Design a protein around this ligand. Structure first.
Ligand SMILES: CC(C)CCC[C@@H](C)[C@H]1CC[C@H]2[C@@H]3CC=C4C[C@@H](O)CC[C@]4(C)[C@H]3CC[C@]12C
Ligand SMILES: CC(C)CCC[C@@H](C)[C@H]1CC[C@H]2[C@@H]3CC=C4C[C@@H](O)CC[C@]4(C)[C@H]3CC[C@]12C
Ligand SMILES: CC(C)CCC[C@@H](C)[C@H]1CC[C@H]2[C@@H]3CC=C4C[C@@H](O)CC[C@]4(C)[C@H]3CC[C@]12C
Ligand SMILES: CC(C)CCC[C@@H](C)[C@H]1CC[C@H]2[C@@H]3CC=C4C[C@@H](O)CC[C@]4(C)[C@H]3CC[C@]12C
Ligand SMILES: CC(C)CCC[C@@H](C)[C@H]1CC[C@H]2[C@@H]3CC=C4C[C@@H](O)CC[C@]4(C)[C@H]3CC[C@]12C
Ligand SMILES: CC(C)CCC[C@@H](C)[C@H]1CC[C@H]2[C@@H]3CC=C4C[C@@H](O)CC[C@]4(C)[C@H]3CC[C@]12C
Ligand SMILES: CC(C)CCC[C@@H](C)[C@H]1CC[C@H]2[C@@H]3CC=C4C[C@@H](O)CC[C@]4(C)[C@H]3CC[C@]12C
Ligand SMILES: N[C@](CC1c2ccccc2Oc2ccccc21)(C(=O)O)[C@H]1C[C@@H]1C(=O)O
Ligand SMILES: N[C@](CC1c2ccccc2Oc2ccccc21)(C(=O)O)[C@H]1C[C@@H]1C(=O)O
Ligand SMILES: *[C@@H]1O[C@H](CO)[C@@H](O)[C@H](O)[C@H]1NC(C)=O
Ligand SMILES: *[C@@H]1O[C@H](CO)[C@@H](O)[C@H](O)[C@H]1NC(C)=O
Lengths: 760, 765
């Protein structure tokens, strides 16, 4: 059966009037909502256009509507009539049809070769957008990647990055998940589990997939892009397993009550989206006021009446029923059918205006209707107000550059009313951006967590480091680094140290020079006292040798020997002062030279005292100078053997032990000091053994006592230096006090009684 | 309309360009004798042979439903609906079509395949070579016995690679064949690393200036002689004519558009000489020749286009109804004189036989034990016939009993025929110009260089450069990416990259190209040299002499008790002389370590000691001792601020030179030479100024020796200072300045020690 209407321009149509038949027949039962309602909507739209003075006042739009029987193979042989008419056939200017995606694809493939524009009303396939295969296909409904983007925006709005997408096994679901994954990874959204759901999957398989979803505790949100039956089975399995999830579903779920049928306990909190549309007031009145007696245009109306109302036309008993009494549920795609018909009519009107300006009717320039110009220049470039629009809504009908509709979806939530009833309530819309109100969602109210699916783990980027990957790319495990492990980059902690803590820089370990090289005033007071005592001793010696030449006692002894003894005391004081000074390479060399010279002059004084006791001043001076030269040679040999350095390292956590002492080991210096001390002790022992006591008795006794005290001090200060092995400050203080005691002994030795006698 | 509708058990469709396309009222006009009549008769002859065959479909008779296309897409699409009208659920009963042997035009084949893919009807083309038809996602029921057009772009790319032709010029043509070919050849060249110099485009306007511009653009590049052509016949002819008019000479490597055609070399055989062209491999069919030569308008009733073809070929009319044409002779016939076999007759026969073999295998497999049309074959599923049986054929050419290895008919995974091409070289004989087959490309390259003319002496076409060794030979890229110039860099620079020489080290030579970034061994370390050993011996002899003089003075200090302070003055003078002598031995140190600072300190101390000794003698028991103590304190202070000079930088920073070859520097004693010379010169001039006053002053006869010694020393110091500074100030030699300075210092020390010891030497003797 063919629905044909007379008119100047014929518009093709294709509707799924009959359902799939199978092996028994090509097509069987008549569709009541997708086949009859949409066909009547198209007829109503054509009637309104023909009765519209402002839309084709002279040109009357005809109709050539066929039945696809919900099958693509039948659709091709049905659509092999428009091409025959183009080649009594009536030439058409374009078809307005195609509900199923496969039927629309086949019709677009067939009609592309013959330049016949096609405007679909219910085909949302994502593979119909490329113009490399469909040169004349347009649609009013938006494709599925728009709702995938809407779901991605919804996920980003609630800061849900750890999701778990669930797909389907048929042609619906694979492309949607493939398109959603790219937009999710472009919006920093992490997918945990991805699987496919089949129609043949039994209850055990659904239980297994629910268990697999539950295998991730941190993934409490699931992005469902499946069919209605698969969603219903999944909710049933989740209720059976007592699983809790925040489901974000596509138009497959929408606001249908069949999915939540018998599973109302687990569907709470689901954020489902649906294609936005409004009912048409005029279409309801037009359809309800239809009867088989006063409707002869529709050839399938009698079969629809027989199927919907249980009766037969053989017996006069079908006149009692009426569509007015029974409730009428408007199909959600009626809007799109009317919009497609009006878009085609407006494109035809615009092309007629641009091709037949003077005349108000069909002109000779439009006797052949070419699909190329009408599609490329007119069909795509339509911008008109939608017919039968609501009172204050602003729907607009237009096409993109792929010939697709404008993505406008409604966001629905499965609320739990206080009365106990479960209902769907709209909580926003998605035209170009998400517009959630967050006021009607039950779990959006301020509470202890609005189902936060943050991530696999809590990100750490304030002060810690996040570089541990347990197996997931975007799972961030943060472990605070050690205080000495200063943060230098995002994936490593530098081993520069703890004392070099960056000052809110975290770049290169900005060094902190806050180190205790030496005590400036906390402990230098004692060293200051030692230096003052040394200066006082030097001044006393300076006053001493002025009258030394006059004094016969000093004159009898070596005046040069007394002068070099005073110089050695001054050298000891200077060595103490330089030890008190801050350590450095030059400072370390100066201290080593000072201690070596002090030991050398002490040994020379002991040797010349022994020589004087045994027995000349020139020989003693030469001997002491040779000894000093040899000591200086060995000191400089040690200095060149082990070079001095600065920079000390210690334990972490701000030890502040840097620059404690020169980086050159003093084992050789200590050995040389011990050797010269032993030589001085041997000289003192020889002097004591010598029996020259009767002559120069007081001075000899003083020298012997001084030597004994120096030896005792050395033998008592060796164990403490050996045992301390640390505490550089205390070691320096001990060395300073030892050298001060040595200088005090030197000044109180035989030189002091001679000065006292001279004064008295 | 006219059509062939021979009935049979199985019917095969047919699409041929019998009529040439036209404009206006006439959709298609003149009969195409070669591509429309010969191919149609070849298909009919193949069908008759298959029907008469006893091994191929013995119980099944093959019918034909052959239509026209008029060499246009729309009319062929309009007639293609008859092939699918029979598969839909009395004036003209339709015939079920198993497959369509149609094609001969890329656009027509594309449209027919688009229409037929919706109804599951296999199609085998015999002439369409478009690369777009290889996309099985858009044409999943299409096959062809001819290879696509991008096989030539591989064959002649391999030809170019064989002769090491890497930097060639490519010329294409406007349309689809020329483009698809030029991007295919560019892809193959980039795969084989062949550079493209220029890419010209030629339109169909046949402008007399565009061709000359293209020739000039090709000619303004003397290092690219091989030219690659993807052009149609007339465009290539116009380009060759323009090249001949411009007196150019190139090595053309063309595609099947040129082939072995004669209309291109007409009047321009000079420039076209030596060109290498590809032609599709095709063999004549003698059986088809016999079948076609025995065709007459009175016995060939199956063909409705034969009357028009006969009238157009012989320019006569069988039924002259007052027409302006002669009456066709009853004895007129077509023979080899006026008929030549078309190049794709064998391809048409192969396509028909491939369809027949696919149907035969399907009939054998589906219903065995019988030879007839079965009930299972009534549905005639096209998907199973194409994807399973048609694409898996393997059979030799039916009318090729000579060759059996290169005559296998089969389709690859994309449903395309095997790519076999013949390489033709345009050569001369001595006055006659003709094409000669010098090779063959069937998935492999095989040429005969000996028989090739003008390319046996292969034209050198390198990649815009020559291979240059990496021995400091930088490769700088000009505006063309493939070109190289191989410009040298500095010899001291060590190569590290390709686009730059990337010098490493300041004064270090490389080893081969990169590894020589290490420090260059300095030549300053030269111990026991010719000019080093001698100064050491001189210094040792001077030190020994000074020690002997000191010992003699010590021995001669007892009896002369008057010199209470003279002995001390002699001792300190000897000590200063020895210190100076040791300082001279310090500068000759070949390693030149950081101890050069201590050497500086020793030299300064020696200079201060000499100055103090000179001042003490000029001034002259307790008072002399006080003067000696003051001089010692002054020397200590002098050493103090001499060491203050080292409180800034003892070793230094670095010592470089303008020469990038030797770089013989100490590298650890690079202190300020100018500052050192200024500090050293101050002491000498101060000593000279202090000693000149004493020389003019009148001294006592007993003390006249001191004044004479001071005067003698004053002259030597000024000469030494004047000689030392200029050499090291500017030249700054590695070791020549050091040895001269040491020699001057030791000579001055010897002079002063002789001056101060002449009197004791005479007194001792
Ligand atoms: C730089 C420091 C460390 C040097 C320490 C030793 C100094 C003070 C000593 C070493 C040798 C000493 C000299 C030795 C002999 C004499 C001769 C005498 O008739 C006067 C004192 C005099 C001139 C001495 C002065 C002091 C002296 C220079
Ligand atoms: C034998 C003794 C008494 C002679 C007089 C003291 C000598 C040894 C002292 C006095 C001044 C000192 C110098 C002072 C400063 C520096 C700079 C430093 O970066 C390296 C060491 C160096 C170069 C010292 C070397 C030793 C030095 C020359
Ligand atoms: C008898 C007396 C006067 C000899 C004095 C010798 C002095 C001047 C010499 C002997 C050893 C020398 C040191 C040996 C090694 C180094 C390390 C180097 O990186 C800087 C210089 C420095 C620190 C030298 C400075 C000068 C030095 C201290
Ligand atoms: C007798 C006096 C006047 C002169 C000789 C004594 C002094 C200056 C000599 C004696 C031994 C010498 C050292 C012997 C060996 C070396 C190692 C060499 O790699 C650097 C120089 C160095 C470190 C020498 C420096 C100068 C030195 C310390
Ligand atoms: C050269 C370096 C290594 C050492 C420092 C110089 C030494 C050897 C010099 C400097 C001053 C000199 C002294 C100066 C004066 C006198 C008084 C005289 O009646 C005897 C020699 C005597 C006591 C000298 C001995 C050598 C001496 C101590
Ligand atoms: C002690 C009396 C007799 C004076 C003689 C001093 C002699 C022995 C001293 C003075 C200067 C010295 C030299 C100074 C520096 C160096 C460079 C070093 O890398 C090796 C040792 C060498 C080459 C020394 C060898 C000994 C030396 C020549
Ligand atoms: C041995 C070679 C390397 C030369 C080393 C330098 C010598 C000659 C220098 C360096 C430091 C100098 C000493 C520095 C200070 C004094 C104190 C003064 O009151 C008497 C001279 C005296 C004691 C100097 C004698 C000479 C001296 C030892
Ligand atoms: N717009 C739909 C979308 C359709 C679909 C929607 C939800 C669940 C499964 C499902 O099956 C597929 C598979 C592939 C492409 C589109 C779909 C169309 O048929 O194109 C369908 C509402 C239109 C109608 O049939 O009236
Ligand atoms: N085999 C061809 C190749 C053909 C072609 C060959 C040489 C020069 C120009 C040219 O024009 C185009 C343009 C696009 C694609 C193919 C071609 C085909 O039509 O596919 C054509 C010889 C076959 C025939 O028409 O009988
Ligand atoms: C998501 O995070 C943003 C900040 O990145 C915040 O402003 C917003 O309130 C969050 N949404 C919630 C908590 O629902
Ligand atoms: C091409 O080069 C190869 C080696 O680079 C050489 O063996 C071959 O003979 C060359 N072909 C020519 C010069 O035709």
């Amino acid at each position: 059966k063919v629905l044909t209407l007379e008119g100047d321009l014929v518009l093709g149509g294709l509707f799924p009037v009959h359902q799939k038949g199978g092996p028994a027949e090509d097509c069987g039962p008549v569709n009541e909502h997708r086949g009859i309602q949409r066909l009547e909507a198209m007829l109503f739209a054509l009637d309104r256009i023909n009765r519209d003075p402002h839309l084709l006042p002279g040109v009357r739009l005809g109709a050539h509507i066929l039945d696809s029987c919900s099958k693509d193979t039948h659709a091709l042989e049905q659509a092999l009539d428009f091409v025959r008419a183009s080649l009594a056939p009536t030439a058409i200017t374009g078809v307005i049809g195609g509900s199923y995606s496969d039927v629309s694809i086949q019709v677009a493939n067939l009609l592309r070769l013959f330049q016949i524009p096609q405007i679909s009303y219910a085909s949302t396939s994502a593979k119909l957008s490329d113009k490399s295969r469909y040169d004349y296909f347009a649609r009013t409904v938006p494709p599925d990647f728009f709702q995938a983007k809407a779901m991605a925006e919804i996920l980003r709005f609630f800061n849900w990055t750890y999701v778990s997408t669930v797909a389907s096994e048929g042609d619906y679901g694979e492309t949607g998940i493939e398109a959603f994954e790219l937009e999710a990874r472009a919006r920093n959204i992490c997918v945990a589990t991805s699987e496919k759901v089949g129609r043949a999957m039994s209850r055990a398989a659904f239980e297994g997939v629910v268990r697999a979803l539950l295998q991730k505790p941190s993934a409490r949100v699931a992005v469902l892009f499946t069919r209605s039956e698969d969603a219903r089975e999944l909710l049933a399995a989740s209720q059976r397993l007592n699983a809790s999830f925040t489901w974000v579903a596509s138009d497959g779920w929408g606001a249908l009550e069949s999915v939540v049928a018998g599973s109302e306990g687990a569907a709470e909190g689901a954020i489902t989206i649906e294609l936005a549309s409004y009912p048409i007031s005029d279409f309801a009145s037009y359809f309800q006021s239809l009867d088989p007696w006063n409707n002869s245009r529709n050839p399938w109306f009698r079969e629809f009446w027989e199927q919907r109302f249980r009766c037969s036309f053989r017996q006069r008993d079908c006149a009692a029923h009426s569509l007015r009494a029974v409730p009428f549920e408007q199909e959600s795609k009626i809007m799109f059918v009317v919009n497609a018909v009006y878009a085609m009519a407006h494109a035809l009107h615009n092309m007629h205006r641009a091709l037949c300006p003077n005349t108000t009717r069909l002109c000779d320039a439009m006797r052949p209707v070419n699909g190329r110009r009408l599609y490329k220049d007119f069909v795509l470039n339509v911008k008109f107000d939608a017919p039968f629009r609501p009172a204050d809504t602003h729907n607009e009908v237009r096409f993109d550059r792929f010939g697709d509709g404008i993505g406008r979806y409604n966001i629905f939530t499965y609320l739990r009313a206080g009365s106990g009833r479960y209902r769907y309530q709209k909580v926003g819309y998605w035209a170009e951006g998400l517009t959630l109100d967050t006021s009607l969602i039950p779990w959006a109210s301020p509470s202890a967590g609005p189902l936060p699916a943050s991530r696999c783990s809590e990100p750490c980027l304030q002060n810690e480091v996040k570089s541990v990957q347990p197996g997931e790319v975007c799972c961030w495990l943060c472990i605070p680094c050690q205080p000495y492990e200063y943060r230098l980059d995002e994936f490593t902690c530098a081993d520069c140290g703890l004392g070099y803590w960056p000052n809110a820089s975290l770049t290169g370990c900005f060094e902190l020079p806050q180190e205790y090289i030496r005590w400036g005033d906390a402990w230098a007071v004692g060293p200051v006292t030692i230096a003052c005592l040394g200066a006082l001793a030097t001044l006393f010696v300076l006053g001493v040798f002025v009258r030394h030449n006059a004094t016969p006692v000093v004159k009898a002894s070596g005046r040069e020997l007394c002068y070099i003894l005073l110089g050695g005391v001054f050298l000891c004081y200077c060595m103490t002062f330089i030890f008190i000074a801050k350590p450095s390479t030059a400072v370390c060399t100066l201290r080593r030279l000072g201690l070596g010279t002090a030991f050398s002059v002490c040994y020379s004084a002991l040797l010349t005292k022994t020589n004087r006791i045994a027995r000349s001043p020139a020989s003693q001076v030469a001997i002491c100078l040779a000894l000093i030269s040899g000591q200086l040679l060995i000191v400089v040999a040690w200095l060149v053997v082990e070079a001095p350095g600065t920079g000390k390292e210690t334990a972490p956590e701000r030890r502040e032990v840097v620059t404690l002492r020169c980086n050159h080991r003093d084992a050789s210096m200590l050995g040389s000091l011990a050797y010269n001390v032993l030589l001085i002790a041997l000289c003192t022992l020889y002097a004591f053994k010598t029996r020259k006591c009767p002559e120069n008795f007081n001075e000899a006794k003083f020298i012997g006592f001084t030597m004994y005290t120096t030896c005792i001090i050395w033998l008592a200060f060796l164990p403490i230096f050996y045992v301390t092995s640390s505490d550089y400050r205390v070691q320096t203080t001990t060395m300073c006090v030892s050298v001060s005691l040595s200088g005090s002994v030197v000044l109180g030795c035989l030189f002091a009684p001679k000065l006292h006698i001279i004064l008295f | 309309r006219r059509e062939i509708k021979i009935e049979g058990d199985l019917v095969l469709g047919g699409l041929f360009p019998i009529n040439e396309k036209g404009t206006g009222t006439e959709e298609c006009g003149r009969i195409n004798e070669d591509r429309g009549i010969q191919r149609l008769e070849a298909m009919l002859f193949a069908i008759d042979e298959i029907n008469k065959d006893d091994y191929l479909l013995p119980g099944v008779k093959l019918g034909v439903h052959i239509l026209d296309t008029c060499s246009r897409d729309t009319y062929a699409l309009e007639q293609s609906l008859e092939f699918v009208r029979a598969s839909l659920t009395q004036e003209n009963i339709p015939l079920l079509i198993a497959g369509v042997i149609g094609g001969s035009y890329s656009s027509v084949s594309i449209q027919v395949a688009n229409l037929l893919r919706l109804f599951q009807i296999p199609q085998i083309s015999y002439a369409s070579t478009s690369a777009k038809l290889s996309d099985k996602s858009r044409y999943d029921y299409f096959a062809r016995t001819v290879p696509p057009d991008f096989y030539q772009a591989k064959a002649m790319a391999e030809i170019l690679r064989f002769f090491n032709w890497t930097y060639v010029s490519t010329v294409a043509s406007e349309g689809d064949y020329g483009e698809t070919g030029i991007e295919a050849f560019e892809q193959e060249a980039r795969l084989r690393n062949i550079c493209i110099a220029t890419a010209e485009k030629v339109g169909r306007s046949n402008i007399r200036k565009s061709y000359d511009s293209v020739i000039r653009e090709l000619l303004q590049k003397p290092n690219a002689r091989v030219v690659v052509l993807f052009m149609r016949s007339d465009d290539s002819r116009e380009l060759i004519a323009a090249a001949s008019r411009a007196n150019a000479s190139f090595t053309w490597v063309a595609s099947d558009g040129w082939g072995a055609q004669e209309s291109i070399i007409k009047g321009s055989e000079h420039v076209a000489y030596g060109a290498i062209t590809l032609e599709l491999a095709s063999q004549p069919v003698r059986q088809f020749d016999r079948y076609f030569q025995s065709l007459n308008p009175y016995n060939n009733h199956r063909n409705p286009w034969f009357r028009d073809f006969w009238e157009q070929k012989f320019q006569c009319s069988l039924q002259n109804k007052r027409n302006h044409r002669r009456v066709c002779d009853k004895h007129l016939a077509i023979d080899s004189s006026n008929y030549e076999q078309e190049s794709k007759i064998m391809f048409v026969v192969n396509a028909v036989y491939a369809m027949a073999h696919a149907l035969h295998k399907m009939q054998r497999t589906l219903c065995p034990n019988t030879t007839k049309l079965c009930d299972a074959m009534k549905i005639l599923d096209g998907k199973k016939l194409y994807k399973d049986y048609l694409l898996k054929i393997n059979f030799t050419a039916p009318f090729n009993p000579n060759k059996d290895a290169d005559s296998i008919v089969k389709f690859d995974t994309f449903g395309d025929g095997m790519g076999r091409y013949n390489v033709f070289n345009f050569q001369n004989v001595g006055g006659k110009y003709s094409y000669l087959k010098v090779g063959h490309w069937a998935e492999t390259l095989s040429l005969d260089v000996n028989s090739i003319h003008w390319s046996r002496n292969s034209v050198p076409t390198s990649q815009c450069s020559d291979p240059c060794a990496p021995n400091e030979m930088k490769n700088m890229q000009p505006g063309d990416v493939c070109c190289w110039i191989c410009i040298p860099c500095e010899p001291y620079e060590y190569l590290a990259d390709e686009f730059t020489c990337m010098d490493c080290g300041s004064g270090q030579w490389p080893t081969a190209d990169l590894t020589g970034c290490y420090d260059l061994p300095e030549d300053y370390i030269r111990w026991e040299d010719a000019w080093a050993i001698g100064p050491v011996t001189i210094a040792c002899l001077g030190f020994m002499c000074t020690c002997m003089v000191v010992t003699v003075f010590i021995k001669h200090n007892n009896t002369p008790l008057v010199k209470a302070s003279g002995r001390e003055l002699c001792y300190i003078l000897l000590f200063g002389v020895g210190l100076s002598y040791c300082m001279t031995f310090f500068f000759i140190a070949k390693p030149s370590p950081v101890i050069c600072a201590l050497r500086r300190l020793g030299l300064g101390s020696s200079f201060a000691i000499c100055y103090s000794a000179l001042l003490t003698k000029t001034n002259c028991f307790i008072s002399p001792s006080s003067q000696v103590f003051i001089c010692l304190g002054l020397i200590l202070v002098q050493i103090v601020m001499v060491s203050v000079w080292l409180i800034l930088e003892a070793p230094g920073t670095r010592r470089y030179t303008l020469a990038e070859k030797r770089e013989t520097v100490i590298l650890k004693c690079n202190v300020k030479d100018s500052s050192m010379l200024i500090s050293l010169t101050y002491d000498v001039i101060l000593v000279i100024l202090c000693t000149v006053y004493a020389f003019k002053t009148r001294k006592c006869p007993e003390n006249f020796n001191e004044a004479k010694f001071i005067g003698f020393t004053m002259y030597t110091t000024c000469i030494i200072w004047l000689a030392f500074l200029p050499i090291f100030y500017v030249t700054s030699s590695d070791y020549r300045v050091q040895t001269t300075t040491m020699c001057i210092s030791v000579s001055l020390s010897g002079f002063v020690v002789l001056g101060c010891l002449f009197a004791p030497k005479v007194h001792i003797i």
